Amino acid sequence: HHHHHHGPNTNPVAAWKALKEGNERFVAGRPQHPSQSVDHRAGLAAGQKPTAVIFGCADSRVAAEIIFDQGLGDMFVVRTAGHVIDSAVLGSIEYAVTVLNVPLIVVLGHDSCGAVNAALAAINDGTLPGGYVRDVVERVAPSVLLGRRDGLSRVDEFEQRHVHETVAILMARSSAISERIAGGSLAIVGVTYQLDDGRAVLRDHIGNIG
Amino acid sequence: HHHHGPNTNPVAAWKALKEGNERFVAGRPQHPSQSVDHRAGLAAGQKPTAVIFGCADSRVAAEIIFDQGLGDMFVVRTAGHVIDSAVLGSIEYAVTVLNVPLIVVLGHDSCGAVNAALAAINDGTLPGGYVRDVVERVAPSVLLGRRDGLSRVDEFEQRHVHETVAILMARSSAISERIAGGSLAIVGVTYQLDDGRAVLRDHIGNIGEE
Amino acid sequence: TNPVAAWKALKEGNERFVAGRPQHPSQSVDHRAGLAAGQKPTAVIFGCADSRVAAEIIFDQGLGDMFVVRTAGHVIDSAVLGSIEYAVTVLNVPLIVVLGHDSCGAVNAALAAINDGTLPGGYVRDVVERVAPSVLLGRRDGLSRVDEFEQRHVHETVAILMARSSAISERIAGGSLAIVGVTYQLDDGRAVLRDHIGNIG
Amino acid sequence: HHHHHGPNTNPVAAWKALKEGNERFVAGRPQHPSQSVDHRAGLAAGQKPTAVIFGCADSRVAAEIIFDQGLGDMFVVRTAGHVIDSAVLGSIEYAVTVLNVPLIVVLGHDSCGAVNAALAAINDGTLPGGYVRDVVERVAPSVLLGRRDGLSRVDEFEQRHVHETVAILMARSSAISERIAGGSLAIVGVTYQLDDGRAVLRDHIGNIG
Ligand SMILES: [Zn+2]
Ligand SMILES: [Zn+2]
Ligand SMILES: [Zn+2]
Ligand SMILES: [Zn+2]
Ligand SMILES: [Zn+2]
Ligand SMILES: [Zn+2]
Ligand SMILES: [Zn+2]
Ligand SMILES: [Zn+2]
Ligand SMILES: [Zn+2]
Ligand SMILES: [Zn+2]
Ligand SMILES: [Zn+2]
């Protein structure tokens, strides 16, 4: 087979709720591991209709589906080191927004982020990496410079500031995103994941998530 | 002792992925490395044994389909696993800072991005916004495929995996030097949405498949 | 200054060039000495890197007249976009000129890729990939001549700048900025107006 | 029209021509060569430039003028602060590999707004918006590395930025780095002085003479 991926998507409130609920089962050590059976997997072959895009860090400890106790076909996932944006990232999120009509973008940071740490070391010490790793650090550095100017001092302040700045760039660069937000068909949420206890902590959002 | 780095070779890293995918295929996943206790030990740092560079598609959830847990794979995902400078820096971060022994390029069937590039080339149907930037980067795979006489969409998906492998090697001396040194391998895989098999298509560097 | 006077100066400059009577203005030792103070150009030229399409020469301008961005086949990436926005927002140039030309090796290479599957390696592929949708779009509309894709590519470049840059699109809406799309002819040296958004007189 | 085929010039002769060129410019005796009606008609055949200049977009740093060249002499890539993105890299590689240019000039200059803006970001946390931030982000590492090495004066950061741009091109492009090892290409770091119009050699990889 049936095609179930046509027709309208859900709303930002229902989409956020399901992610909230899922991270709660994960936190409590009670994951249901849903939407992953052999039969569910086989029915996904004709198309996808995820209810969210997670734009997360590539960090191996921040596996988005696991941490929000989702399965297959639930979330479109874009992941780069320190969730930095280039034109392929931006096109990836726009595909989900404009073709899959996802009602929710989650920008997902976390503590002990090596991309945020590298940008701190660059600014404090002039320690810069080489090759394309420098391109990642380049894109994080402004978050740290803007935080510094606002009197931020703690790593966790910079990590949170980086999520907010990522939200801000998505908004400024993409009329696809900002026009759907204005229209009320899309919300964007800034979240930090806590490696200690596995809580996904809402910090920021544009649009109604309930 | 406390060791730094994954302390594993490409053969073993690949073996664990193959075995995890068999568990998933069989509908017998372990859901390993995601208990509250194991999770708590990860706040200390990450030692993943591979970087997965996969499609953003909600049905190709890399950790689930290889039946891995937290701390196991650094994950980079864009639509059609297209590359640009943040993508490349992210993969290079895992290769050079985390010293991962394996890069897995994960394509799959029913890829929207490959489909969009085929429509671009067949009809001159092009998306707008930054989604076009994704399609632009897939289009060469289709053109080179067409030139070699491929016609089937599964063939283009497979060709695109191969072209992505080749781009990583061409643009990143960090990657190509470690492959030459024997400390790194790269594997191209197609995931079958039907049955969940991650199918081996391509590799450079010894992964124990000889 | 203003978009109308900016484009007038450029068109007249190109006429001096076409006639083989260049002034070579604004390049004296003394004028140059005064530029060390600051720059206040009247236009940004986004042109091709081609050695034969030297923008200051073909518009018969001098030093401090035009901010110049040049990539193979006037393809855009973020550094390009950022450069144009610098002239637009920091220098307040009233005019953007998208400068294409005939016998463009990038449009040609994009032609060869779409017709043959002939593609370059390295970063040249990244240039061609960016020109390819111009060729695909023009082909969908029954374009067949090489000079025609060249023009279509100038139009697409104009459209991309408008769509990607609210700094540009807002100023064009407010009337302080105009974007002009032009094709340079290698043979007679004429810079030919093909496209524009905003009032250019 | 004709279309000519053949080997391009060598790194020593290409640098000599520009060196001599800028001397005419400095001296206020511009010959404005390779711009005649007839010469222009000749170039319809094909371009055969002897150099790629990768320069700043700054309207005061007009490359053909300051080096007193004409049409068909130099392939020209310009971005604000001569920052590199993949279109820039692809542009330079087209010149290097297809046009076989024996010389790449990375052209910085004094009073560079891109370098200025990067200094203001690291010192004050002053960051521009939109895509201008992408330019400043790419210069910022040259300033951080400068500061670490004890540089203070603005001119020293401008020069350190030219050096970092040369190093990125060498590191990102195997097409470039192989040709420099083969001896068929050279890369030069130059700083243009707005004051006297002088283009000053700073660093170089390959033999320029
Ligand atoms: Zn049904
Ligand atoms: Zn259907
Ligand atoms: Zn991180
Ligand atoms: Zn915010
Ligand atoms: Zn330790
Ligand atoms: Zn896909
Ligand atoms: Zn051209
Ligand atoms: Zn002849
Ligand atoms: Zn020929
Ligand atoms: Zn400058
Ligand atoms: Zn140097």
Short mmCIF file of N, CA and C in Angstrom, two decimals, chain A residues 1-58, unseen atoms left out:
data_model
loop_
_atom_site.label_atom_id
_atom_site.label_comp_id
_atom_site.label_asym_id
_atom_site.label_seq_id
_atom_site.Cartn_x
_atom_site.Cartn_y
_atom_site.Cartn_z
CA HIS A 1 2.60 -2.62 -0.91
C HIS A 1 1.54 -1.53 -1.09
N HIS A 2 0.88 -1.17 0.00
CA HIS A 2 0.00 0.00 0.00
C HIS A 2 0.92 1.22 0.00
N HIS A 3 0.49 2.33 -0.61
CA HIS A 3 1.19 3.61 -0.41
C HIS A 3 0.51 4.40 0.70
N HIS A 4 1.22 4.64 1.79
CA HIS A 4 0.69 5.40 2.95
C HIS A 4 1.37 6.77 3.15
N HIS A 5 2.27 7.12 2.24
CA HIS A 5 3.09 8.31 2.42
C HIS A 5 2.54 9.58 1.74
N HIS A 6 1.42 9.46 1.05
CA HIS A 6 0.79 10.64 0.42
C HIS A 6 -0.06 11.41 1.42
N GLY A 7 -0.59 12.54 0.97
CA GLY A 7 -1.54 13.29 1.76
C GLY A 7 -0.84 14.14 2.79
N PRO A 8 -1.61 14.88 3.61
CA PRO A 8 -1.02 15.87 4.52
C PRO A 8 -0.16 15.26 5.61
N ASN A 9 0.79 16.04 6.13
CA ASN A 9 1.54 15.64 7.31
C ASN A 9 0.79 16.05 8.60
N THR A 10 1.32 15.65 9.75
CA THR A 10 0.77 16.10 11.03
C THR A 10 1.14 17.57 11.36
N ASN A 11 0.81 18.03 12.56
CA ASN A 11 1.08 19.40 12.99
C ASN A 11 2.28 19.46 13.96
N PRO A 12 2.86 20.67 14.16
CA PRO A 12 4.04 20.79 15.07
C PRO A 12 3.79 20.30 16.53
N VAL A 13 2.57 20.49 17.03
CA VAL A 13 2.22 20.12 18.39
C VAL A 13 2.24 18.59 18.59
N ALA A 14 1.57 17.86 17.71
CA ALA A 14 1.61 16.40 17.71
C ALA A 14 3.04 15.85 17.49
N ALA A 15 3.82 16.55 16.66
CA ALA A 15 5.17 16.10 16.31
C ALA A 15 6.14 16.23 17.49
N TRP A 16 6.13 17.40 18.13
CA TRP A 16 6.86 17.65 19.37
C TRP A 16 6.48 16.73 20.53
N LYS A 17 5.17 16.59 20.77
CA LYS A 17 4.62 15.68 21.78
C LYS A 17 5.21 14.27 21.70
N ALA A 18 5.17 13.68 20.50
CA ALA A 18 5.71 12.34 20.25
C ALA A 18 7.22 12.27 20.55
N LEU A 19 7.97 13.32 20.22
CA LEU A 19 9.40 13.38 20.58
C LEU A 19 9.63 13.54 22.09
N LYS A 20 8.90 14.46 22.72
CA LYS A 20 8.84 14.54 24.18
C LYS A 20 8.59 13.18 24.84
N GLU A 21 7.47 12.55 24.50
CA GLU A 21 7.12 11.24 25.04
C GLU A 21 8.24 10.22 24.84
N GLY A 22 8.80 10.18 23.63
CA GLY A 22 9.86 9.24 23.30
C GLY A 22 11.14 9.42 24.12
N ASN A 23 11.57 10.67 24.30
CA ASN A 23 12.74 10.94 25.13
C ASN A 23 12.47 10.58 26.60
N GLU A 24 11.21 10.66 27.01
CA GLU A 24 10.83 10.27 28.37
C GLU A 24 10.99 8.79 28.62
N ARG A 25 10.66 7.96 27.63
CA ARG A 25 10.82 6.51 27.79
C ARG A 25 12.31 6.18 27.80
N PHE A 26 13.06 6.84 26.92
CA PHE A 26 14.51 6.71 26.90
C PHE A 26 15.14 7.09 28.23
N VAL A 27 14.82 8.28 28.74
CA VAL A 27 15.32 8.72 30.05
C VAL A 27 15.03 7.71 31.18
N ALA A 28 13.81 7.19 31.21
CA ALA A 28 13.38 6.26 32.26
C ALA A 28 13.89 4.85 32.05
N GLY A 29 14.68 4.64 30.99
CA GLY A 29 15.21 3.31 30.67
C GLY A 29 14.12 2.36 30.22
N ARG A 30 13.05 2.91 29.63
CA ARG A 30 11.88 2.09 29.22
C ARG A 30 11.57 2.20 27.72
N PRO A 31 12.58 1.96 26.84
CA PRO A 31 12.34 2.22 25.42
C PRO A 31 11.43 1.15 24.85
N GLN A 32 10.54 1.54 23.94
CA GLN A 32 9.64 0.57 23.32
C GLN A 32 10.22 0.13 21.99
N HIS A 33 11.23 0.85 21.49
CA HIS A 33 11.81 0.60 20.16
C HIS A 33 10.71 0.41 19.11
N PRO A 34 9.88 1.45 18.89
CA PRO A 34 8.71 1.29 18.02
C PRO A 34 9.07 1.37 16.54
N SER A 35 8.10 1.05 15.69
CA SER A 35 8.21 1.23 14.23
C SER A 35 9.49 0.65 13.63
N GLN A 36 9.81 -0.58 14.02
CA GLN A 36 11.07 -1.22 13.64
C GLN A 36 10.89 -2.68 13.30
N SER A 37 9.68 -3.21 13.45
CA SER A 37 9.47 -4.62 13.15
C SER A 37 9.76 -4.89 11.66
N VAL A 38 9.89 -6.18 11.33
CA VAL A 38 10.08 -6.64 9.96
C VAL A 38 8.94 -6.17 9.03
N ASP A 39 7.69 -6.22 9.53
CA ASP A 39 6.50 -5.85 8.74
C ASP A 39 6.34 -4.35 8.59
N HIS A 40 6.60 -3.61 9.67
CA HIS A 40 6.63 -2.17 9.56
C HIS A 40 7.73 -1.71 8.57
N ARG A 41 8.93 -2.27 8.70
CA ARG A 41 10.01 -1.98 7.79
C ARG A 41 9.59 -2.22 6.32
N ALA A 42 9.05 -3.41 6.02
CA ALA A 42 8.60 -3.72 4.66
C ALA A 42 7.52 -2.78 4.08
N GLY A 43 6.64 -2.23 4.91
CA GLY A 43 5.61 -1.28 4.44
C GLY A 43 6.13 0.13 4.15
N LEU A 44 7.41 0.37 4.41
CA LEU A 44 7.98 1.69 4.23
C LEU A 44 8.63 1.86 2.85
N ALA A 45 8.64 0.78 2.08
CA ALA A 45 9.38 0.72 0.84
C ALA A 45 8.95 1.70 -0.24
N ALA A 46 7.67 2.09 -0.29
CA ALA A 46 7.21 3.00 -1.35
C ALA A 46 7.45 4.47 -1.11
N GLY A 47 7.65 4.86 0.14
CA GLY A 47 7.83 6.26 0.44
C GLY A 47 7.87 6.55 1.93
N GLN A 48 8.25 7.77 2.27
CA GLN A 48 8.39 8.13 3.67
C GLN A 48 7.49 9.34 3.93
N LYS A 49 6.98 9.45 5.16
CA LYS A 49 6.35 10.68 5.66
C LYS A 49 6.74 10.90 7.14
N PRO A 50 8.02 11.23 7.39
CA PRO A 50 8.46 11.52 8.75
C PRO A 50 7.70 12.73 9.31
N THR A 51 7.60 12.81 10.64
CA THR A 51 6.85 13.91 11.29
C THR A 51 7.81 15.02 11.78
N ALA A 52 9.12 14.81 11.60
CA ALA A 52 10.09 15.79 12.06
C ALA A 52 11.38 15.64 11.28
N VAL A 53 12.15 16.72 11.23
CA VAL A 53 13.55 16.62 10.86
C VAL A 53 14.39 16.91 12.10
N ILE A 54 15.27 15.99 12.47
CA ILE A 54 16.25 16.31 13.49
C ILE A 54 17.53 16.74 12.77
N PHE A 55 17.99 17.95 13.10
CA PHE A 55 19.30 18.46 12.65
C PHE A 55 20.23 18.41 13.87
N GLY A 56 21.02 17.35 13.95
CA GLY A 56 21.75 17.06 15.16
C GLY A 56 23.23 17.05 14.90
N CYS A 57 24.00 16.92 15.98
CA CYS A 57 25.41 16.68 15.85
C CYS A 57 25.71 15.22 15.43
N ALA A 58 26.81 15.04 14.70
CA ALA A 58 27.32 13.72 14.29
C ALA A 58 27.88 12.87 15.44
#
